[PDB]
């Protein structure tokens, strides 16, 4: 994004913030208007969020290991 600093620099910070927000929004916006399935993909994503949270929570009983 914007990295300038003193002599140990230039790679890790930049590939971090660059890679995350860059690859996110460009890999999203590169095609597929969709108009309809951000609704479905957010609904499935967040239903999977509550199912993963409750699933790990009630899966915190035992596993016989």
């Amino acid at each position: 994004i914007k990295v300038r600093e003193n002599e140990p620099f230039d790679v890790a910070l930049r590939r971090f913030k660059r890679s995350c927000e860059k690859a996110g929004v460009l890999a999203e916006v590169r095609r597929r208007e969709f108009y309809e399935k951000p609704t479905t993909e957010r609904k499935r994503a967040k239903a999977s969020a509550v199912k993963r949270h409750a699933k790990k929570l009630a899966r915190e009983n035992a596993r016989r290991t």
């Binding site: 990295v3 790679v11 930049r14 916006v29 095609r31 597929r32 208007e33």
Partner: protein
């Protein structure tokens, strides 16, 4: 040939190709080299190694302008984009700062529908 001191290294880094345009501070071009023109063809253009060979074949043929230090702009979410700046640390340059000029619209025009 102009005897320039510093330059600005734009790296267009699309999916199918990387082109590397080393310019000056002013914004007008001094020399460019692509990942297609370095012998790599078709699918082989779409590798980081062809971007590295592109940055080499630009970093010489900008020798005659005498650039000690350059900035790095990188546009495009491609498979190059990091090997091509390792290939500018290694090519004998002083990297001033690295930016990101990847165009993110505050969603405007409509993208294509492409895949099935």
């Amino acid at each position: 040939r102009k005897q320039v001191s510093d330059g600005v290294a734009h790296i267009h880094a699309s999916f199918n190709n990387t082109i590397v345009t080393i310019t000056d501070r002013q914004g007008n071009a001094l020399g460019w080299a692509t990942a297609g023109g370095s012998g790599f063809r078709g699918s082989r253009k779409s590798t980081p190694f062809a971007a590295q060979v592109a940055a080499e074949r630009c970093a010489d043929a900008v020798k005659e302008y005498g650039i000690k230090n350059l900035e790095v702009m990188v546009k495009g979410p491609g498979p190059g984009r990091e090997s091509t700046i390792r290939a500018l640390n290694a090519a004998g340059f002083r990297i001033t700062n690295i930016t990101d000029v990847t165009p993110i619209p505050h969603n405007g025009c409509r993208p294509p529908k492409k895949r099935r």
